[PDB]
Every structure is written in structure tokens, then in C-alpha cells.
Amino acid sequence: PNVPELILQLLQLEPDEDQVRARILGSDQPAAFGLLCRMADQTFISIVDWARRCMVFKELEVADQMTLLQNCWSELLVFDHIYRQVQHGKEGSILLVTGQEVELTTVATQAGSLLHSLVLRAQELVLQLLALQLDRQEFVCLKFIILFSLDLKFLNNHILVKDAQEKANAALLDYTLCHYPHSGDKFQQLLLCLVEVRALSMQAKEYLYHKHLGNEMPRNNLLIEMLQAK
């Protein structure tokens, strides 16, 4: 009944859709590829500032922060999109952070095979999460889990990163056991959906690489700069 304190603080740090819908803005017919690209780039910037405000992450050195964010940027973008579909919008349409809704018909007719496949599998994951009744507390907790999903070996500060991982998983478990009276083990099935999200985000990386080899993306697209970090 009592939600863990970790989740309470993460909720307090979650910027409600209002404000970065606002700021992303101001910054039928064929789909505007380039402005959708810049929209994804602004989404990534808002996610990086969210991370900057987070617990534990705020105490690490910039190198460890860079390592962590380099390991999960695509995953966090995809998860933000999926939770945007869960929380709002219809299953005949996809909602984008600007508030625009794109119907799956438009995707099927305009998109290539791989983007189409990716949107479809994202909708599959959305349905999965709806069936397990994913809620905002779980969303922020899973975001925090993804952020620290990197193995300790690649980081200088093992102690704090591992404390964060442990406490995040404990918070999720405690919350699911106390608020989810149904059967299934929501903890484990949420974690396996995170597995699926990471796979989908790898596919998204492949899509962006395909666009880059064809020189179809804007010149200074930030997702392409992250893709090439090595």
C-alpha cells in the first residue's frame, strides 16, 4: 500500500507532459521526415535532462554519466514512445510527443518495410504493457532501471551504481507485490518486456544506420551522432 520512496522521488522528478510538450513545440499529406527527426532529437535532450536531475546519477562523474547514457539512449527513447502510446492515444493511431496522432494506415502506406515493422512491434509491446496494467509509478521505476542497466565493470563508481540497481529492482518488486493483486508475477514479466524493448531499440539503431548510409538524415542529427559514438 505504501509506494517506495525511490518511486515517490522519481515521480516528483518526472516533468509532466505539459511542459516539454510545450518546449519541444516551436523548436493527408506526406510525413515531414526532417522535423520528426528534430522532434526525436528534442525528446532525447529532454530525456538527458531528466537523467541529469535523477538521484545517484547526479552524484556520478561525467564519464560514468556518459557511459550510462551511451548504453541506453535508444532504449529510453523507445520506452518513452511506448509509454506515450500506453498512457494516451488509440490503438488505431500512434501519438507523438508534439500531440500529433499518426494512424497506422498512414504508416503502412508511407513507411518502408523496416520502419513499419518497428512501429508494429512497438504497438505489440504497448498492448503487452496494457494487459499487465502498467502505471506511471512502474513507468518511472523502469526508466530508472534502464538508466542503470549497464554492468558495473564498465564504470568507475561500482558502489553507487550497484546500490541504485538493487534499490530500483527492490522498489519495483515491492510496488508490484503490494498493488497488483492479480496473478502472473508482474515484476518478472515487466523485466522481460524490458528485454523486448532493448531488442526493439537495437532494431531502431539499425534503421537509423540504414538511413545514414543513404544520406537521408539531416546533417547534424543528434541521434546519428550518438549512433557513431564508439
Binding site: 538527458v48 554519466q65 550518438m226
Partner: peptide, 12 residues
Amino acid sequence: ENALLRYLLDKD
């Protein structure tokens, strides 16, 4: 290193 990440972590 990733200059873009250093940028968005350092400010703006």
C-alpha cells in the same frame, strides 16, 4: 569521447 553527451551534460 562523445562530445555531444559532454555538451548536454555540462549545460544547455
